[PDB]
Amino acid sequence: GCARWCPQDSSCVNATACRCNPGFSSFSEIITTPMETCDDINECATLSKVSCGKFSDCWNTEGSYDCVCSPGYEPVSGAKTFKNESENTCQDVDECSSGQHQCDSSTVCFNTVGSYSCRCRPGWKPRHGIPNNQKDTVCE
Numbered sequence: 001g002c003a004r005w006c007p008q009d010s011s012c013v014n015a016t017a018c019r020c021n022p023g024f025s026s027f028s029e030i031i032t033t034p035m036e037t038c039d040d041i042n043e044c045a046t047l048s049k050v051s052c053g054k055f056s057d058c059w060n061t062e063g064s065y066d067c068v069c070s071p072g073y074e075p076v077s078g079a080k081t082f083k084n085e086s087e088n089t090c091q092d093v094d095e096c097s098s099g100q101h102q103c104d105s106s107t108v109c110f111n112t113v114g115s116y117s118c119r120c121r122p123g124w125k126p127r128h129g130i131p132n133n134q135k136d137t138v139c140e
């Protein structure tokens with residue numbers, strides 16, 4: 001059988017009951033009424049569950065979730081999206097060597113984990129207001 005009144009995001013279990021689809025939850029384990037709702041589980045809140053690993057972030061979605069390397073980090077496996085630690089290959093991006101940085105020609109790019117900084121070349125001095133060791137740094 002298959003109850004046809006099954007609420008959204010749930011699938012029939014028999015002729016008089018339904019079950020929330022994987023990724024959703026309901027108040028009762030078994031839906032026996034069309035008034036019951038199947039709500040999205042936030043996999044990123046349960047701090048209990050394992051992590052995405054280092055340099056990553058958990059992003060919740062309606063019906064699922066995704067792990068992504070944080071800004072300043074990129075996956076060596078080309079896999080922009082992953083599910084667990086084991087799939088984590090987020091390494092830091094070297095904006096200086098990759099020439100992706102945007103330091104004033106008057107400065108020298110210095111790479112850091114997750115970011116990067118522009119420093120004053122020796123014998124040079126920072127312009128006014130703006131300080132050194134920064135992405136907006138400028139020297140004269």
Ligand SMILES: C[As](C)(=O)[O-]
Binds near residue numbers: 062063
């Ligand atoms: C993509 As949907 C509205 O079936 O959760």
Ligand SMILES: [Ca+2]
Binds near residue numbers: 060061062
């Ligand atoms: Ca979710």
Ligand SMILES: [Ca+2]
Binds near residue numbers: 072111
């Ligand atoms: Ca970096």
